Design an enzyme around this catalytic site. Sequence first.
Site, PDB file in Angstrom:
ATOM      1  N   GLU A  49       0.907  -1.161   0.000  1.00  0.00           N
ATOM      2  CA  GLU A  49       0.000   0.000   0.000  1.00  0.00           C
ATOM      3  C   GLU A  49       0.950   1.216   0.000  1.00  0.00           C
ATOM      4  O   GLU A  49       1.751   1.357   0.932  1.00  0.00           O
ATOM      5  CB  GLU A  49      -0.933   0.101   1.165  1.00  0.00           C
ATOM      6  CG  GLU A  49      -2.306   0.755   0.911  1.00  0.00           C
ATOM      7  CD  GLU A  49      -3.026   1.155   2.170  1.00  0.00           C
ATOM      8  OE1 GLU A  49      -2.465   1.283   3.246  1.00  0.00           O
ATOM      9  OE2 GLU A  49      -4.247   1.325   1.980  1.00  0.00           O
ATOM     10  N   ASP A  60      -5.076  12.308   7.359  1.00  0.00           N
ATOM     11  CA  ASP A  60      -3.852  11.725   7.902  1.00  0.00           C
ATOM     12  C   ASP A  60      -3.364  12.443   9.158  1.00  0.00           C
ATOM     13  O   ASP A  60      -3.510  13.656   9.319  1.00  0.00           O
ATOM     14  CB  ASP A  60      -2.762  11.671   6.812  1.00  0.00           C
ATOM     15  CG  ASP A  60      -3.044  10.556   5.814  1.00  0.00           C
ATOM     16  OD1 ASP A  60      -3.010   9.370   6.172  1.00  0.00           O
ATOM     17  OD2 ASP A  60      -3.333  10.920   4.657  1.00  0.00           O
ATOM     18  N   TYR A 175     -10.947  -2.781   3.422  1.00  0.00           N
ATOM     19  CA  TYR A 175     -10.095  -2.100   4.426  1.00  0.00           C
ATOM     20  C   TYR A 175     -10.944  -1.842   5.676  1.00  0.00           C
ATOM     21  O   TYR A 175     -11.740  -0.892   5.741  1.00  0.00           O
ATOM     22  CB  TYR A 175      -9.482  -0.845   3.838  1.00  0.00           C
ATOM     23  CG  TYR A 175      -8.354  -0.198   4.591  1.00  0.00           C
ATOM     24  CD1 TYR A 175      -8.466   0.126   5.950  1.00  0.00           C
ATOM     25  CD2 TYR A 175      -7.161   0.125   3.941  1.00  0.00           C
ATOM     26  CE1 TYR A 175      -7.424   0.739   6.638  1.00  0.00           C
ATOM     27  CE2 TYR A 175      -6.110   0.742   4.611  1.00  0.00           C
ATOM     28  CZ  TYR A 175      -6.252   1.053   5.961  1.00  0.00           C
ATOM     29  OH  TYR A 175      -5.196   1.657   6.591  1.00  0.00           O
TER      30      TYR A 175
END
Lengths: 255, 255, 395, 395
Positions: A49, A60, A175
Amino acid sequence: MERYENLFAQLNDRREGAFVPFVTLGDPGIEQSLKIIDTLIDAGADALELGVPFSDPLADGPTIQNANLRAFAAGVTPAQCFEMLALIREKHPTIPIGLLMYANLVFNNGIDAFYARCEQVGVDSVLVADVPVEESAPFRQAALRHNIAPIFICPPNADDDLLRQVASYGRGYTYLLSPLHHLIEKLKEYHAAPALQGFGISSPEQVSAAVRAGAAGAISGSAIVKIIEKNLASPKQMLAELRSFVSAMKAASRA
Amino acid sequence: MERYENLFAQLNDRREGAFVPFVTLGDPGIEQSLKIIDTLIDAGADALELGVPFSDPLADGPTIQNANLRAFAAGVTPAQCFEMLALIREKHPTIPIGLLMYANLVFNNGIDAFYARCEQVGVDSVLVADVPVEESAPFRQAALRHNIAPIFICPPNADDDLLRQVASYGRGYTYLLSPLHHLIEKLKEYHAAPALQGFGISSPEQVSAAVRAGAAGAISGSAIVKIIEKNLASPKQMLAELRSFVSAMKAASRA
Amino acid sequence: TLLNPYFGEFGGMYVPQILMPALNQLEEAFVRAQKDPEFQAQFADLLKNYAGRPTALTKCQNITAGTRTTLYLKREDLLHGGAHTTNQVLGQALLAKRMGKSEIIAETGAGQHGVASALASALLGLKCRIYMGAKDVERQSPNVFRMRLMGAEVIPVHSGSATLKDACNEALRDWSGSYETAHYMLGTAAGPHPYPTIVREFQRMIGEETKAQILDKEGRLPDAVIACVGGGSNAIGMFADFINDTSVGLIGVEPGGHGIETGEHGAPLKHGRVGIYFGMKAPMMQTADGQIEESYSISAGLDFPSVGPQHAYLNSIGRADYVSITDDEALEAFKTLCRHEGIIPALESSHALAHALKMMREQPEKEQLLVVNLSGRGDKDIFTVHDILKARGEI
Amino acid sequence: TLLNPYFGEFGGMYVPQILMPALNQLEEAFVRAQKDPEFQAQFADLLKNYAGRPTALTKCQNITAGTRTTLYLKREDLLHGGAHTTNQVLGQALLAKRMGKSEIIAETGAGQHGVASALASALLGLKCRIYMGAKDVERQSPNVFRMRLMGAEVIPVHSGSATLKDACNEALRDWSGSYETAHYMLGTAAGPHPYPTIVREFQRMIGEETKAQILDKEGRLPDAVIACVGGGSNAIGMFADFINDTSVGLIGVEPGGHGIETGEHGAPLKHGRVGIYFGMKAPMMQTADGQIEESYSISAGLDFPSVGPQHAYLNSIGRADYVSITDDEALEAFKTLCRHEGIIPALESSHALAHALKMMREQPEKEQLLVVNLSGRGDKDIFTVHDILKARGEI
Ligand SMILES: Cc1ncc(COP(=O)(O)O)c(/C=N/[C@@H](Cc2c[nH]c3ccccc23)C(=O)O)c1O
Ligand SMILES: Cc1ncc(COP(=O)(O)O)c(/C=N/[C@@H](Cc2c[nH]c3ccccc23)C(=O)O)c1O
Ligand code: NA
Ligand code: NA
């Protein structure tokens, strides 16, 4: 897409779980980045990834923010990333490669154009951090058209309709963001792509813990980046440290 | 009151004008102040106008403001001023003495009480800077009762009714603040107390100019203070300078 | 005079003879204007369309919790400029123009009178010069910038205590020489007649509105109206309309400074004695021998050793009650309104609030409807307060 | 969704999946509240009795001299807090409480959204944390003190350009983790649906009042309404009610900064290109390869490299026109209003005024009735401006 299927097929045959490390392309430099990636693969990474540096990573934390800054400082651009991807794929033909993108980077020169480019370099999947299933239509359609697996995140606050959507639209893998065991059951029931645990994976126990729980593997979202960060001064140590870590994380996946 | 009459009576007999210097009591010190006053008298002052230091002299310019500060610094109080006045009068029995006050100093321990005190020490007149004829009743009545001449200012913007009031209420002299020649005529016509020119008197020409114009004399409101101020470092020079100035101003009054 | 210059024994016109004509002229203009519908129309227009009247009457939501007190705030902090000072300046400015004056003289401590003078001057095309004590220039700095930006000349006064009284002195001295072209825009309901009267009449709307508002909201008059007193303008503006309503308590709050006992306060009405100064006969802080004493307050706007004559009169007859509030009490009230009602009040106004809080806290089961005049906003005070709270560890 | 998240091709909900539930919840609460008379009553009460609505509509007296232009100013500078930002915060705060949230997250550049968030939080008993770029903390300092005094936590953002976009980033990151107990009080009519819609509806009163006021005073609608555009809240609030009045021009003014040609500006609507960022599809300042470009403006409140989607749509269909105004032009407009109307405007608002002045000056014999949204007061800007005027010799 296919590279993922082959992986899960074989992994299953050895009753092994998948270990997927996350790394930012070009951190801390182009050449060193390539070196790092080789080490992860060598150390036992099942798939990769890879992040493409974005100016305003609003989804993030500080670890990834810092990584982006390092890459940017190294003069890394989206064009350079695609160049790197080509070199990687040239060396490692079977390892599944997934990109972690921000929508603007995908949208910039046309959605279709982006996915066509991915196909060309040999990318297997794309996860767009800021595109919810609700807005995914154009993205997932272009991906499918270019034989790219659209990856979707299954958040802790997922409902039944979300589960069903993600099961329907997603390819490659799901995910998962950590009732855990219940999520797994439902996803399986809906025939969703193999679920990988993405939340909290920083130590081997968490890996085994996830596989045991019913997950197909685990994604280490920032644990690797932390090692890069801390060993900036000694690349030598960096690689050694990464090798030991990955090797240990992978081992934990055989159960 | 009488001391003023005697002065104007005699002055007239010599066709002389009156020269009245203004000084702040206690500036720049008690002893030096007394010395200064003696010098003015010796130099030829016809009468005296003495200021009692007030904290907030809202009707005074910087020259007088500074004088007050010097006096205050010297620890001068209204009580000390009365002590000084006694000493002065003891030495100079016939010179008319006028006080320039602020209403609060007069009002403080009772209006009547203040005027009784003036009478006791031998003060001839009192001018209250911030009491217009319109508010003067209690002040002028107490003055009269204590044989003190209430002095009133005739401002440049005086009207007929003002002239008449001032002519009626005032005693001793009229404090003129510069049609000049017309004011003089009207005052005379109304039988006002002898008019003294108070505005701009800083040089001898202005003195003669005033007498010639029909005034009974001139008051030097700050010219003297300026000399004190400038000679603070040399009291010797101060006295010499004052002597020369007064002598020159007085001379100018013989016409 | 056309009007009575005295309130009982207080007031008058204690100025140098040279200023009498100016005062008489002003009084005449005022009387005329008051009867001039054109003037009334213009004034009302500016109040409404430019200044932002009527100001709201806000009911406190949190600070009265656990008591039987209902507290309302008359929001003068919402007026253009940031304080009640704007009301009367607009009226006076119209008078100046009517008298053919082209320059304005004003004094300020809090800088709120200063700001209002500057804005009114900018709008009506008058040249403005403002006297401000050097101490005030420093502690109310934000207001200095505002004044300067609007084209007003700000003159620092370094004499004496370098506060309001010192600026007052300079302003009078100036006017004495320029009365022909300059109008003296006195900042409070003090000084020589007709100022106390004019300022009251041009501030009257505060109380008039409050009465209408409270009646609408509560269906009854307040038990009491509370306002701080420096010179007396905001209080009298609030009080005026309630004077004949005997059931309504009128409480004026003077600054206690460091505490009355310390001698470092600004509470002449209750702790001074009658004197003659600043063109009036009123209670003053003075020495035994009649020198004017320097006041003290954390609040620049209340740092004045005297008070308007109508207040002295109201006290004497017992129509209004006057109390004091210390620096520390005002600070707490400031902090409290900020944190619990989301309103930053001027330190001056905080004095009035502090008293209302005392009233409620001391007798928590006493049912009472109070109105506080929130005379202004605290933008001007933030640097000052922050540095105090900080030096203590409350910020 | 219950409502349409798109304005033509602009808008949407481009956020991490984890935030969708929060957005859906917000949308639902909003729809419900809008139909809840109890909510409507409470909102209106706070606007009227606490914030001070309706704001005045001031006719300029001097600055239009020698022209055929009639200029009115919608006085949002008179609102409690000092800017239009207060309107929508009150609405959002009521929503937060209705959703059982106990904490508030907000971003600010000018510190006006910050202040409004803090005051609303203090009043309604919410815990408030505010993200502010380090650059803004410095240039809009007065607002930092105000926020802190009201008990809000101010967090300086040092990343990137250390301005609005950087604070926006941090706020979203925060919410991603605290959505369960915290409500994200987005400061403008931008971001993911339903924010653009909610902020417009909670700012709608600006234009509604203006229309009623102008009709009362002039007996006709304006030729045009002008407002500055940073994110788009004050403009849309003003524009909304006039959209169906085709004869009325709608002009939005974006910051030209140092000049468009320099690349140092904040005018994405006219000089950017469509992108996906901050949860929306809208015109953005971006590099050739899709990285977000840093904006620039003297005005902290306009220093944002994107714009609300409804503006992008209004432009595209040609209903509204958008222009730019440079730093220098805004400064002159600031100076002018100060000195000739006695009003100190926010530097942001000065941008809109500068454009109206241009309109009148360029064609002085053209008869036109204009309305400018005076979005806020300039107290926050005085230290900044003073130091510029000074460095030039205009102060
Ligand atoms: C916000 C606010 N609240 C209350 C007050 C207290 O004033 P008052 O007692 O009149 O209601 C002030 C003072 N404002 C003026 C006070 C002032 C101007 N000139 C004066 C002359 C004498 C005494 C006071 C003043 C200022 O310093 O700008 C103020 O600015
Ligand atoms: C007085 C004033 N006028 C105009 C504006 C421009 O805003 P708008 O285009 O929305 O009408 C602002 C900005 N106020 C906010 C702007 C803001 C808050 N959050 C944002 C997020 C994105 C973009 C802008 C903002 C502030 O910095 O406090 C302002 O404070
Ligand atoms: Na006082
Ligand atoms: Na923008």
